[PDB]
Design a protein around this nucleic acid. Structure first.
Ligand SMILES: [Ca+2]
Length: 71
RNA sequence: GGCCAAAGGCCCUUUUCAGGGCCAC
């Protein structure tokens, strides 16, 4: 993917990532998975990539829903 | 390079496994 430079898009997309990193599922995710994480393994959406608005948001929707494997 | 995931174009919000607005069709 080809990097994004606009802070008005990066700061916002960074925000959405923190929200998912705030959850207890993400904290129970990193604590149990050491970057050998495959796909199918829910993965943080690439902030620097070239995505449309509805496009990146939709990846966050599925990311946040996907994270909820925990207790 | 290319292919898949995501994706109508943009925006706000911790109603956030969520809610909402305009434009378009
Ligand atoms: Ca699709």
């Amino acid at each position: 993917s080809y990097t994004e430079a606009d802070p008005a898009i990066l700061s916002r997309r960074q925000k959405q990532i923190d929200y998912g990193k705030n959850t207890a599922a993400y904290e129970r995710y990193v604590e149990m998975v050491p970057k050998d994480e495959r796909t199918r393994h829910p993965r943080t959406p690439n902030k620097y990539g070239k995505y449309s608005r509805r496009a990146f948001d939709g990846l966050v929707k599925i990311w946040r829903k996907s994270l909820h494997i925990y207790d």
